Amino acid sequence: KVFGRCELAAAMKRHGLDNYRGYSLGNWVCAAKFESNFNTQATNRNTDGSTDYGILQINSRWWCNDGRTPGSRNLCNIPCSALLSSDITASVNCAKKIVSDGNGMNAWVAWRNRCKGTDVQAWIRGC
Amino acid sequence: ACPSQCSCSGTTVDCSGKSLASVPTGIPTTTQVLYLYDNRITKLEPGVFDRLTQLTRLDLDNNQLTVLPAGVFDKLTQLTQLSLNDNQLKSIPRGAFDNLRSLTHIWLLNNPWDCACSDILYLSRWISQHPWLVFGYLNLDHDSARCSGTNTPVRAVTKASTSPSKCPG
């Protein structure tokens, strides 16, 4: 599923990401835009053997299990394929695991560069 | 001969998640992958890896190391991946990474890197010179190795910000 911006914003509010660790809703919408363009089936093969999955391009070395990354840790305890679903629940919970403190979204370099510092609530307006 | 505390498939030796306090003895010299992550290793003996010249991946992350011995990675010329993250390291000794000619990925984050001290300069300069090498928990991020307290990138630290006065001993 490729989400619309509004449709994505609503689903993320529903799964409680608004102000999660201080981060307001547009932040999470903005990050997903740059990671995957709102496409839940987005997939990227890495040179280390891992792969990135879903709307926020969550990694199979650290976070999820795809059965094809050796020494992976599955810190979120989901199959990577649960991150490709049309239902964003698993992606959100895994984004919640990654964001440990009030600085945890620094994890998404494209977020840090293209999103942080701007008026992110624009991504939430019009809906 | 695979070590008692460890599972061993081909040239992979896995000592991860086994409540270990030290690096097992008897790791075969032909090992290529060595998982030691998620343990309670607090120190490494000088030369612990010296005979393990076929290593391509070494995971040392999520232990409790405070310091690394000098020369510890010098023999590891085929090593492509190194995780050091989530330990208690304040610096990296002068030249730790110099013999690592096959390196493509290093993980450094979640260490209390001490950027007030002179000892940090090797690392800050190394990362400046190797912007394709440093990964956080997603992809490439040469800002992911961060100063304790300030949370600013280690790579950015210059002599002007440091003093020998603030190093241990």
UniProtKB/Swiss-Prot annotation, chain A:
Catalytic reactions on record: Hydrolysis of (1->4)-beta-linkages between N-acetylmuramic acid and N-acetyl-D-glucosamine residues in a peptidoglycan and between N-acetyl-D-glucosamine residues in chitodextrins
Pfam families in UniProt: Lys
GO biological process: cell wall macromolecule catabolic process; defense response to bacterium; defense response to Gram-negative bacterium; defense response to Gram-positive bacterium; killing of cells of another organism
Annotated substrate binding sites: 101
UniProt tissue specificity: In the egg white and polymorphonuclear leukocytes.
InterPro entries: Glyco_hydro_22, Glyco_hydro_22_CS, Glyco_hydro_22_lys, Lysozyme-like_dom_sf
GO molecular function: beta-N-acetylglucosaminidase activity; identical protein binding; lysozyme activity
Disulfide bonds: 6-127, 30-115, 64-80, 76-94
Main location: secreted
Localization of this protein: Secreted
UniProt superkingdom: Eukaryota
GO cellular component annotations of the record: cytoplasm; endoplasmic reticulum; extracellular space
UniProt entry keywords in alphabetical sequence: Allergen, Antimicrobial, Bacteriolytic enzyme, Disulfide bond, Glycosidase, Hydrolase, Secreted, Signal
SUPFAM superfamilies: Lysozyme-like
Catalytic residue positions: 35, 52
Task performed by this protein: Lysozymes have primarily a bacteriolytic function; those in tissues and body fluids are associated with the monocyte-macrophage system and enhance the activity of immunoagents. Has bacteriolytic activity against M.luteus.
Record's subunit section: Monomer.
Record family assignment: Belongs to the glycosyl hydrolase 22 family.
Protein's UniProt name: Lysozyme C
Gene: LYZ
